[PDB]
Design an enzyme around this catalytic site. Sequence first.
Site, PDB file in Angstrom:
ATOM      1  CD  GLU A  10      -0.110   1.123   3.313  1.00 57.23           C
ATOM      2  OE1 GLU A  10      -0.822   1.980   3.907  1.00 57.23           O
ATOM      3  OE2 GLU A  10       1.136   1.248   3.429  1.00 57.23           O
ATOM      4  CE1 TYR A 280      -4.611  -1.892  13.043  1.00 59.45           C
ATOM      5  CE2 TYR A 280      -5.434  -2.786  15.108  1.00 59.45           C
ATOM      6  CZ  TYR A 280      -4.624  -1.928  14.423  1.00 59.45           C
ATOM      7  OH  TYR A 280      -3.738  -1.125  15.127  1.00 59.45           O
ATOM      8  CG  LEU A 281      -6.398  -9.917  16.235  1.00 61.70           C
ATOM      9  CD1 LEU A 281      -5.409  -9.238  17.195  1.00 61.70           C
ATOM     10  CD2 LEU A 281      -7.545 -10.588  16.992  1.00 61.70           C
ATOM     11  CB  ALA A 282      -4.929 -10.918  10.407  1.00 57.95           C
ATOM     12  CG  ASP A 283      -2.952  -6.241   9.152  1.00 59.92           C
ATOM     13  OD1 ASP A 283      -2.955  -7.095   8.244  1.00 59.92           O
ATOM     14  OD2 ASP A 283      -3.756  -5.289   9.121  1.00 59.92           O
ATOM     15  CD  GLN A 284      -1.874  -4.599  14.512  1.00 55.93           C
ATOM     16  OE1 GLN A 284      -0.841  -4.222  15.073  1.00 55.93           O
ATOM     17  NE2 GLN A 284      -2.359  -4.111  13.374  1.00 55.93           N
ATOM     18  CG  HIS A 305      -2.762  -2.588   5.536  1.00 54.56           C
ATOM     19  ND1 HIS A 305      -4.036  -2.215   5.112  1.00 54.56           N
ATOM     20  CD2 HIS A 305      -1.972  -1.475   5.430  1.00 54.56           C
ATOM     21  CE1 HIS A 305      -4.023  -0.925   4.792  1.00 54.56           C
ATOM     22  NE2 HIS A 305      -2.790  -0.469   4.951  1.00 54.56           N
TER      23      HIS A 305
END
Lengths: 334, 335
Positions: A10, A280-284, A305
């Site tokens: 991105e 979003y939790l997946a990214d973290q 992301h």
Amino acid sequence: MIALDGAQGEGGGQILRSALSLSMITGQPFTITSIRAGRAKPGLLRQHLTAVKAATEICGATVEGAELGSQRLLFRPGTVRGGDYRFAIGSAGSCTLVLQTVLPALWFADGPSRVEVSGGTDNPSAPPADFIRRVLEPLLAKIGIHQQTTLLRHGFYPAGGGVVATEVSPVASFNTLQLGERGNIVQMRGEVLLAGVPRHVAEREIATLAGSFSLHEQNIHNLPRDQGPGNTVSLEVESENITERFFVVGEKRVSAEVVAAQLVKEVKRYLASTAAVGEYLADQLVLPMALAGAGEFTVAHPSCHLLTNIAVVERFLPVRFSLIETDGVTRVSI
Amino acid sequence: MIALDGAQGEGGGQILRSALSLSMITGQPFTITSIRAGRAKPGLLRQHLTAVKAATEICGATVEGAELGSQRLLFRPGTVRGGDYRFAIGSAGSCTLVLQTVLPALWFADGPSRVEVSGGTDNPSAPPADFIRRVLEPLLAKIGIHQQTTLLRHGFYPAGGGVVATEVSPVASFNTLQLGERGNIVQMRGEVLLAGVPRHVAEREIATLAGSFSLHEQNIHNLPRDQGPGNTVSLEVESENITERFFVVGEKRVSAEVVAAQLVKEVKRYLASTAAVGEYLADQLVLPMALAGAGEFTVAHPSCHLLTNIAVVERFLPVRFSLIETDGVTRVSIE
Ligand SMILES: OSC[C@@H](O)[C@H](O)CS
């Protein structure tokens, strides 16, 4: 010396924060170019500068290119140290983003630490600071990471003023997290946060949530008016294998019902897949799992992301990720 | 009505261009908000507007929001018509991007077509217009898609001036294309295009390619000074099951050797994995296989562009892509 192209994926701030973290953990220095090259205001903005200085301070780095609009940066970390850190991002400034930069490195510090950040905590573009404590930390604890975040004051965009403080201890060992199936829903709960915003706005939001879901609890939390105006609505989905929490931060010219209905649609999209974690939790979970050298989770769909966090991790760490997406569920694993 | 947020995934013109194509093909209208919202110069730019305009002209569409800076557009296609069209992007504007917006709809046109476009053909930021005939078209032909592109003239960035012409026939029947493994090397060929650049530069460039690979052929093509300055170096890797061609467009003050080494690098990258197709090409087969309803390829790694194409495609077409990325390669298959 890792050479990063800031125009991968991105192509924004995520690349820089993830590298800053990984550089600190691994001690590998790096240079990144084309930092946000296509964006309205290109290069390092004031918030990026804040993140780079915070990093610099926790590990005594040596830095080149840390200036507004700069598109090049060279970062050479030193030893990560513990101790009491206080940063001020103020402004729009997301607390969350400083914390995500510095917290992972402090997991490798030379002693326990305390990180205080003042600035925005609740902004409609991103998950609030509250996501760290309520969703991320209990999954970090299962990985063997000791990190406890306290929201001491909310800063609702465009107002700053919020105060977040996280206590951290160095990790002894990483455990393997394995998430596949959420499991059966155990309970859902809805909460409305209000500061200087009429009560009826929380009663309406709670009633839109309650129209679609059976709620174990319907909470209204009123904060001092000096923190307002602000309104945040969240819905927690406690399943057998995982607790997720989805947040909508209310905007100035948006009504209660529209804020609530955006929350309801996000929750129904999570429930409609069998995936255990949201996007979003997946990214973290990517870094902590990279760090343990093993683990897996399921996420509905890979996102840009997710790809970019995986790529930046794989440049600094010898781990490789596998992604097997096949039936409206993507399994992400070491 | 299909609603798209143009800030998803990559956040740019690609999403717009593929929804235009898909809306035309299926007849489903769509609206898209936050077009390029994060960019330096946001919303619809000149090039994007030229693409919506060519699309509006081949299908007689009802359109709202087609203006400079708009971040919202609504598009309601009519019937795709076959015929002979001419679009001018001029400027640097790439002919490929207009072409990639209308050609696919013309595969579902009510008769043969001919598209001619004028503008840039060879720019350092993207594979040249030449990729279409040399790479993509043989692959579209196996999917049952019959189109043929000609480079009539080159326009080397930062100049426009080039001319591309494509002929298309509506598809009669789609076929399942299956690419696994590259198979074994068959031959490698090097080529340099020049326009108002000394021949020594081409010689240098072929001699650097020759330094890393065995070239079966080494052509040098000089164009009239008219079309320059420009210098495009390319290297084709024909394997048993697939042929690829990688290109570099030489930049104003960049050595021969540095141009050629960039190209050796992209070729060794492709040959560092067993995938059949590079990232760019995989991004081009998503739509055509979705339309056939079946197909697969291998690409080294999933990229953001690939994800963006697959999500826009799955909003319009009743297909789902699976991604199995495991031992240094990703299998992309459609069901
Ligand atoms: O890198 S080859 C040089 C040639 O292409 C011109 O200098 C382009 S402006």
